[PDB]
Amino acid sequence: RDVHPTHYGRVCPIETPEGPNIGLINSLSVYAQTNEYGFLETPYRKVTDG
Amino acid sequence: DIVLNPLGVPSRMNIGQILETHLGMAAKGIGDKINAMLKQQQEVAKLREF
Amino acid sequence: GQNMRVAFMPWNGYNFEDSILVSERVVQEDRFTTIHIQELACVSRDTKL
Amino acid sequence: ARVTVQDAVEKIGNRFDLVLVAARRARQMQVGGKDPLVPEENDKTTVIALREIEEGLINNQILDVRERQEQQEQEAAEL
Amino acid sequence: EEFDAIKIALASPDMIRSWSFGEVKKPETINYRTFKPERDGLFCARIFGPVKDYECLCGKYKRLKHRGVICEKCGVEVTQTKVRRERMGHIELASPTAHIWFLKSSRIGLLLDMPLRDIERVLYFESYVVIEGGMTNLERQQILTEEQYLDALEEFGDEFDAKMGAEAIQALLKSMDLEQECEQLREELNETNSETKRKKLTKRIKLLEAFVQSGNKPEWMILTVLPVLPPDLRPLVPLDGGRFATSDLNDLYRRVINRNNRLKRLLDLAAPDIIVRNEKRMLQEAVDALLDNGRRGRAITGSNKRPLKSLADMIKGKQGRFRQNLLGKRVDYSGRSVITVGPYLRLHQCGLPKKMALELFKPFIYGKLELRGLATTIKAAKKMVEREEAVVWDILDEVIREHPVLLNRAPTLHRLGIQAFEPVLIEGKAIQLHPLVCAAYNADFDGDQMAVHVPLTLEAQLEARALMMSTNNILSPANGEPIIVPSQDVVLGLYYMTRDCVNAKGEGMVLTGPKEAERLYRSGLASLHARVKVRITEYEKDANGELVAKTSLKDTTVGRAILWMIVPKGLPYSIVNQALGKKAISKMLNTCYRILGLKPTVIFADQIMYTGFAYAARSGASVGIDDMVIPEKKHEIISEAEAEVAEIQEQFQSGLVTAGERYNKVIDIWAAANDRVSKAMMDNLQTETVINRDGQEEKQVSFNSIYMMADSGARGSAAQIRQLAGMRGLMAKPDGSIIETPITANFREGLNVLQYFISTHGARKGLADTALKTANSGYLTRRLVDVAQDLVVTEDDCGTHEGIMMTPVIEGGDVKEPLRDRVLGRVTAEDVLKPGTADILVPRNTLLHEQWCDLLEENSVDAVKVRSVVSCDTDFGVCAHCYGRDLARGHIINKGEAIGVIAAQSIGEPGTQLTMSSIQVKNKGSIKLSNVKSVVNSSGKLVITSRNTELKLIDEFGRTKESYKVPYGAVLAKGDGEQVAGGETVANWDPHTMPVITEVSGFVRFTDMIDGQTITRQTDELTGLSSLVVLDSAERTAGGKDLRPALKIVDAQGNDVLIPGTDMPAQYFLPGKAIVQLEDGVQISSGDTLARIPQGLPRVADLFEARRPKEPAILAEISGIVSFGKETKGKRRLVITPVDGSDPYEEMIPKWRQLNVFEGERVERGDVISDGPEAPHDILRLRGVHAVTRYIVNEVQDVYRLQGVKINDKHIEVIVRQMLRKATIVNAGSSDFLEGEQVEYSRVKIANRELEANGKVGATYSRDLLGITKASLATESFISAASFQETTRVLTEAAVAGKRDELRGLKENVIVGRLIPAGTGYAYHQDRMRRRAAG
């Protein structure tokens, strides 16, 4: 039920109920998608030489 | 319109709620002059500046 | 929801523990009115009688 | 009286016997038709008992006496 | 109707035939087309009876011409209804098969001297078994395989008895007579009573003569004729959709009835014996499946692919008939609503809405309609209730006056879960309350559902008035301070009403009456906070409870004059002459009913929130952004915090500092920075307010109402005002890492994204914990009411002797719990004195209320005998003089009020918030330390050579102030019986070593230790000088691991230097880690160090669980000299020696833990030997009972006291007195040899046998302590033990016992429905018992 720092950007850490299912129900972030294999993904801007 | 308890602010640490209330004071704070200038019915080019 | 003009003070114990207070103006302008649609039905059968 | 019964618990000394002394006395006022001893001031059957216990006119010992004076005369009527 | 008791036995086959009404044969249930039952079915009318009345099935007999005949064409009975729940059925079985509760719970394998897997070898017909050896080569209970069974036929054929099947167990039980078995067992028990032979064999002897006294027969363990459940409790009803639905039992019979028919059809055709034995499998699968589905293997399932509900799951667990339909229920005359607050009421009045209260009193409205005669009939009144005449609102107004009503909120936390008000009708749709009782429920006004109840009977209509009106309990039974404390907003405006400042105009004027003191405020001439002398008029009871007057002026403000009109003439002015925060108001409330009665306080509390809210609204209190100010001495200090964390960022990369010590240094500077930023913000909210008045500038208290919120502590505290200003301290990832960079900025200047993300862990770790704790705790509260259910105050004064002496708890720190506040509400155990000698204040028993706590307070008493609940010795209960003051009312408890629930409640409730050297004395004092053995050092000062010594800091009188424990081998610089200075470290030694210091004086020699034989010589590398270094037990060589290396302290001759004052020699028999520094021949003196030996809610869960720890610090069986055993064949042993008795004993000790005593040291019995935590049972076996409970009530009270929750100790005392409800007996003479029995019954029988009947023919006893999982289970009653846990093993062990029940417990008097023998009913139940004396 704890939030790992790989949840960052893929699964929101606030939107959850406070009943007995508190650690289970989770929603995905704004810009997340589903990759061709099934893993999660999140966009990032690529810095090139600053 | 609505009166509520002012002793819920520090022990929920919701200083966001006090932060919200001031903007709505300004939100009609632009709107009332527009209503002051529409029924009194001055001009177009006075309004487009404002 | 709606916008409303809001104050902040204790009143004569009507905001004692998190209990909020209205006027009649928010009911006269009906800004907090909802509709509901329920459903009713009836069935007709044949019994052994 | 109305909201308290605290001065009456001195008149017995027990909390739970204060239940049963009014439980007997109010029961005869319901089905028997007995008359009260304290004036009503527009109250129901249960609360008029505790005023008489506050004035001490109803006690656990004395309640049987008014039955015993009745029981010694009720069998006297038939035989 | 009325019955005395309840009784179990085993059911005879003939007793099953008696109750039944017909033999079911065919498995039909309803004829498919016309919904009528069929003959001999599961609903057969010839067996069970009718559905209608006087109406037959074939329609032959009508019009009551045929009354007294069964209708022979259809067989239906004629007589009156309500019989479909009363009759039972029976069925005959072809082959008698085995029950399932006596197989794999086994009570036959115990009884037939065989393991259960070998008696299973018969019930699947894989193995034969032998009944009796006619020819004596074979014996009883011989397992033979199938081919070996045929070799038995080839040997003899007829002269032996061997079958295979469930018939054989029937024949096996018929064979043995129990008398020549049990009499042989007692003949066998006495010859060898070794331990595994002891307890195992008597468990048979517990059951074997029990069958003789129960009179039953053990052949009835196997059923031949199975009963049938009545047809109502397995109903088959047409549904609202026109289909049917059956319970699960009414097809499982169609498994048994069908597989019965396949057997009786088979045996008259005589199939071979691989088909026939397979048939007797499935009945034993099916007579299983009637009794239990999910027990013996894969369960039998229906079409839904889910397990079928058995007969066992009717009784098992919280889904069963116990906790869902018997103890709790549904009830009529009920309702619910959302709750809301209406503060216009008085204290005892509560709201009740209109169109709820019309249905809730519908029988009352009909009766008063038929009494006035406005309603002609009953149906007309139901016709008129929709007309809504105005008199209906009057008759309802007539009937609701002074008719009380109950308020509820699920879940019930403690005794204040339900109260009783008088209703006041409003026109809405919501329940209004009074605002002061929200804290009693722990209900907040955010959408609960409070429920109502209406008492019907005349007694309960008094019982609401007599016990549970809101006025008649203001004392919460946890602790004798009122729960009617001003909660959350009332403390705000009342704090505004008393305030000191020079700002208000007209200050210093004089007001004559407090009446006209209000007059200056109300027209608006000066503010309520301005200092003007007022004439005050108070009254005291300084005469014999008689009022006198006094009148004077006092220098105060004009606000405090207005509050004087509310205190009702019975308390001085000093209670409201102050700042008046929540620390003051609650103890003002305690002062009133102390002095004035009860009738003032309910009025005095009522006049608070009237004048409380009305001035707060005239005040007005707000909150703004610039109101909560961000200081200036934070970010420059953060600019210093960036000027030190960038420093050791560079020193980390150099390679000088480590990682973990660097982790201690940033948390040294950032976590203390929560306190460095604390002094900037408290300085910028206390005295930034400057309102000058007839001068240059001035200082006063704050005008922000944020400090004035915080110092009240309603919401907000010293830490809660900090996170509105700066960083909120520290954060922790719940996986286990605490971050080096927590928050720096604040709630007004924003949070960064990563700082927001890490602060989520502070929520979701904690937010999931509240629910889990709540779940655990409600399980715990259920497991506390169970073990303590029996206690009622039966007698007043048992008159037993002395018990516990009381001591304060203030060791280790300041004054924590004063002695007066524990002994308050208790009584004197004896005639106790004053320090003026022989000045007794008590004839052996007085109530110690606060008036007598004055006499204790003026002297210097710190030690008093208290009559506990442990020494109370009345039969089946406790007495009033051993329990003392009922804290919930405020006097001695009346005889008949319940105890064990009111202690099990008030332990359960606060558990929700439960889960979240160099010795310096403070002041001077006399030094009084006793039970010591110390010697003067070569330095000259006090050396601690005994483990029992600990310090005590004493005042000028004799009372204790501080105390600290000191271990062995320690050094002081001071002395005892003397005077010391303040701010002083009186004790100084190295604690990291456990030194091997020496009371002995003389030379030390290298004897009894040889290098290369006993130990090795690893000399000191630097200076060169070392000693024969004593190495560990296995780390040395095994050739001299047998020799205990004994350094011998020798003399000028070189002989055995003994202990000073005794003849016993002094040589240390050392295990390893004993590095001696001094060489051979170096003389030691008094105190020379030879060597050095260097170095939550689950807590309250286990301590009433009585769970044993993992390393028990075990104690000594007996005193005297102690030594070491064998050469650790797995573990070492301890040959200890008593002083004169039997010295044989030795046992396994894990020597790898550091021992305390050595092979030549002396000890007194009952002292700590190994190290670690300690098990309670060994404290029971070694100490008495008083030292056990005084350890427990010290232990569990500290877990609450750390969280600041005050519980009186009398609650936790009675649950250990119901923890000891059993005993194991030592000797014999009248009873069993050793087995367990109830320790209440022992003191009966030794007051019978070892009283004047004989000298001694009874027995002596031990005491046992048993955890709460089974201490309820072994009880003289059984239904209460059947009520909650392990529901199979409670019935069956009692089922063959032939037990009975006297209905002693109160829980069993709930499920019968009579009065409880407590509360009111204790006046009733003493009448019915004495009619049973002559009756």
Ligand SMILES: [Mg+2]
């Ligand atoms: Mg609530």
Ligand SMILES: [Zn+2]
């Ligand atoms: Zn018929």
Ligand SMILES: [Zn+2]
């Ligand atoms: Zn007692």
